[model samples]
Every structure is written in C-alpha cells, then in structure tokens.
Target: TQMRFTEEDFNTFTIEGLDARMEVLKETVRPKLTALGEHFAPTLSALTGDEMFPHVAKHARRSVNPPADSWVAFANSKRGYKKLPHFQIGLWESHVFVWFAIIYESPIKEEYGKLLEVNQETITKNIPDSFVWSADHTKPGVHKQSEMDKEQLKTLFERLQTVKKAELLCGIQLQKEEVLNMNNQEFLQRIDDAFKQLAFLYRLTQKVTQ
Candidate 1:
C-alpha cells in the first residue's frame, strides 16, 4: 500500500465512540502514517542535523469523545515527542495539517517562542502567506498567515512566552478535496516541502534545547 490519504480516511473521525474510531483508524489510517514515519525519520534527521525520531500517534482514548484528528510526530528524542518542538503530519475530518509545533507540554515553549519572536521579520516574510498558524493543536481551524501581520504573529509567540497554556504551530493545512486528489508521491513531496519551510523554526529550538 502506498502512503496516500483518502476521504474515507478523513471520515474516520465521523465514527462514534473511542473504540470504533480507534479500530477504523488502526485499520485505515495508521498504516499510511507508518509509511510516513519510516520515510520522515531519516529525512528529518538529515534536515535538522540530529537523529530525528518518528512517533506515530497511537490514538489514546478520552471516554465517549473520539479523537478529532491524529498524526505522526517527528522529534529528536525517541522516548517521547510531546515535550519537544516537533514536526507533525496529521488529518482532521475536513483537512490535513503539516506543522512545526511547540505545544503546552514543552518546557521550552517560553524560550522557543522568544526565539520565534526575535526572528519575527524573517518568519513573517519567509513563510508563504497562504500557510496557516494554529495556537492550539487540538482544534482544526487556523489563522492564515496572509491575514495576520508580523505584529499579530508576534502576539501569538508573546503569549507563548508568558502564558503557560499557550502553544504555537505553523505550517499548511490542505483541504480534504485537495488532498484526496493527489497521488502518494505528490502528497509526500508536499509534506517534504512543508518540513523544509518549517526547518528553520526547528533549528531555533535546537539552539534553545542545546
């Protein structure tokens, strides 16, 4: 099987209850994510100048609430990824997101946000305006870079430095139709391209982490 995602895969979230959705995810989506994990672990290792590790989401449960999305995360540590500035490729029912993420679980969010804040000009300019930014990873909706000025972008990182719950993720979110139209190779190339644009942020985190 190729590493291509489909409408049926995205529709996995529409299933009710944790177990039913988990079963569909394991059978339908996880295999493709596994392929992505294998492809990116070495690819990102080369890009970030570290031994990057890929951790596929295991679809942990939350009572009656089924997950809205799931992803494969890439980070420097093999033990766990949540506490690190990481790269993610995941799908929501309506779209797919490829992000450079610093979630609340990270202890270095303040320092990492400061790094992004300090480089606001470069980040605002270098990243394509059509790219999206999300303050929280759990939600599917995002703010497009085009609508937000450097000052507004800085507000996000500023909060990251000051607020304990603040988090930041920057990248692209592909609509469900757009993704379903692509072949495996096209999608994989887009994922690679997304990570290349995100590599700078990850490099900044390396400086803080080191």
Candidate 2:
C-alpha cells in the first residue's frame, strides 16, 4: 500500500481548466505518478508473470491543465507496450479504475473482435456482473453489464470483427468513494482483485502467450 498523496496534494492539484491543471500535474505531479506506477509493477508482474511495468505514453504531452484521469499500462515488455490486450490501473480525482483498453483508433479492432467471437462466452462469463465497460476512454460515463443490452455488445463485437476502425474492450471500474475510506492494504487488494478479473478476460482473448 502506498500513500504519497496527502490531503494537501489534492488541494494543490486543482487548476484553472482541466488542461491547464494537467500542465501543473505533468510538471508537479507526474513524477509521483511515475513512482506509483513503478511501485506497483512488481506485484502485477508476479501475478501475470508477464514482466509488467510502467508504460508512460509520450503522445499525450502536458502543456495545459491536469488530466481528468491518469493511468499506467502493463504489457508483456517484448513489445514497447501491451498494444495487444493490455490492462490499466489508473486514477481520476473522483475514483480509481482498472480498464481493459481497446483504443479508439486502433487498426487491429476487427482482428481482435474475431478472436473474441471465438471465445465470447468464456470472456463474458469471466467478467463479474458488477463489471463495467466504457465505450469512449475520453469520457467518464460507462455502461454496467446489468444495464447493457445484448444488441450493443453484438454491434461492438461484430464491428470489431469487421470494421477496421471499430474497437471493443471490457473491464471494471471502482469508485474512489468505495476505496478512499479503506486502508492502504485493502486498496492494494482491491486492485489485485480487479487484475485477477481482468486476467480472466485476457486469458479468454487468447492473444497473449507471453
């Protein structure tokens, strides 16, 4: 369990706009984020046995405000990052969440869908009924399994199967209110639970042999 951020950290973290606040976040806060990522990598590595570590993407540079959310990606390390069926543990002020990311503009969407199609039952069944799916990473809203429709899942999966630009990814989201009150060890265990659930999804995808 880590506890770098104090009450003061959140207080100073706020800035004018989201982008502007993120600029300060990048300069003042990202090093802490980096540390947090590095700090957590080993436990995940042991769990997946996949050399998981911090993947700090260079694409999203911080010149403005703080990001609404921040995340660290875990990959098998043979490739630069997971790129193929990666898991993320991230935080936004409101909460911390774990995501199974399928990026918006990925070229392999269709291929991934085909793989999921081959094993959709295992994949869906592996997910906890309380799990959630976010269609757009940039937004905060997500659809819960209990609330999601079969048709939407079909459209996303089939689109991922056939459409070059289409993407379908699934994962879980945990609210900060749920974890903030918990102690450090409990927080870590919660993350571990999320990863275990995610690993089930990853195994079903069958894209990683590493």
Candidate 3:
C-alpha cells in the first residue's frame, strides 16, 4: 500500500551483478519512477510556461557496470535531458536526491553561471542553508549550503562559466534512513519543497536559454 521506496528497493543496489541489479531495478524501481514522473511532469509543465516532459532514466546498455543511480528528470526538451537545465528526482545507494541540474553537456552554462553569480546574494537567501550544492552531476559528494562561505559558493558558478566540463546542481539529499522513514506524503512534500526552491534557479536559466 505504500507508494514510496522500501528498504528492499534501496537494497537493490547491493546485489552482485549488473544483470541482477538491473533485473531488480526494472521490476521494483522503474515503476515508482514512472509514477513519480507522471505525478510531477504536469507540476513542472505548469510551473514554467513550457510543457515539461518527464523522462525516466533508462540506463540503456549499462551492461558493463551497474547503475550507481537513476532518476526521473523533467526538461523542456522531449528528446533528451542531458543538453538542458533539468529538474531531477533520483537516488544514489546511500541517499535520495532532488535537484535542479545543469550538467557539462549544456552549452548554455557560461551565461547561466554568470547570471547566477550576479545574483549570488539572492541565491544564498532564497535557497535554505540546509540544502546542498554539487559541482558535478556524476558524483555523490556535495557541499552543504550551511557549511559553505560566499567565496566557496562563488567558486562553483565561476567554474561553470570558465570550464567546459563544469556542472552545477543544487538540491536536497535525504540520507537512506531519512528516506526509508518517510511516508509517501512526507516524501512528496520534501520533493515539492525542494523543487519550488530549485525553480528559482530554473527561472534564471530561462532568462538566458530557451
């Protein structure tokens, strides 16, 4: 009767082989992600003027190594998300992440980075101190907002503007226990709160890119 992740779902990551994990994820996890995608795509589509499409991660051809994480991502583009500033709901084995992400694939990062830096004070105020930031989308490590100085925050944006490979993500990460403890309503509300704050960054990206 629960619409949220069980500890067993999280344990899918601990399985031995690429095939075993993928098999478990395909049955137990993807459906929840699809439901989440359906639940939120409309919310995002309405939040911004554009119709957002929720593309659940397929992890196609990941036969070499098992997926470390997966997500339901929404973006203006229906074709793919990698080249866009997208909103994400996903999980690493250790945690659940809800994010507004601009990865290295987007050519628009330069302008977006400059814009964010210019509004760094507003960013600091608007995004809660308990939230966290990441400079790379591929990794699980992050810098918590409560722990960072203005200079440190500035550095992430500066890197995005100057370095071709740079990426930035800002969001909330629930530890495994916190995630496991959440009821469906609590889980949904946490993601909703995270997304609402992240939309501020999304709005900034719209100022520069479509």
How do the predictions measure up, each by TM-score?
Answer: 0.96, 0.78, 0.95
Error of 2 at 91 (Å): 2.1
Local distance difference test, per candidate?
0.88, 0.63, 0.88
Which ten contiguous residues of candidate 1 have the minimum total lDDT?
57-66
lDDT of 3 by residue, 77-168 (tens): 88988899999998878888999999999978899999999999999999999999999977889999999999999999999999999899
**Best by the TM-score measure:** 1
Error of 1 at 23 (Å): 1.1
Decreasing lDDT order of the candidates: 1, 3, 2
Please state the error at residue 169 of candidate 3 in Å: 0.0
Candidate 1 structure quality by residue, lDDT tens digits, 101-136? 999999888898888888888888789988999899
Superior by TM-score: candidate 1 or candidate 2: 1
Q: Candidate 2: minimum summed lDDT over ten consecutive residues — where?
A: 3-12
Model 2 pairs in collision: 19-64, 19-65, 20-64, 20-65, 21-65, 21-66, 22-65, 22-66, 23-64, 23-65
Off by over 4 Å in 1: 61-64
Model 3 lowest lDDT segment of ten: 1-10
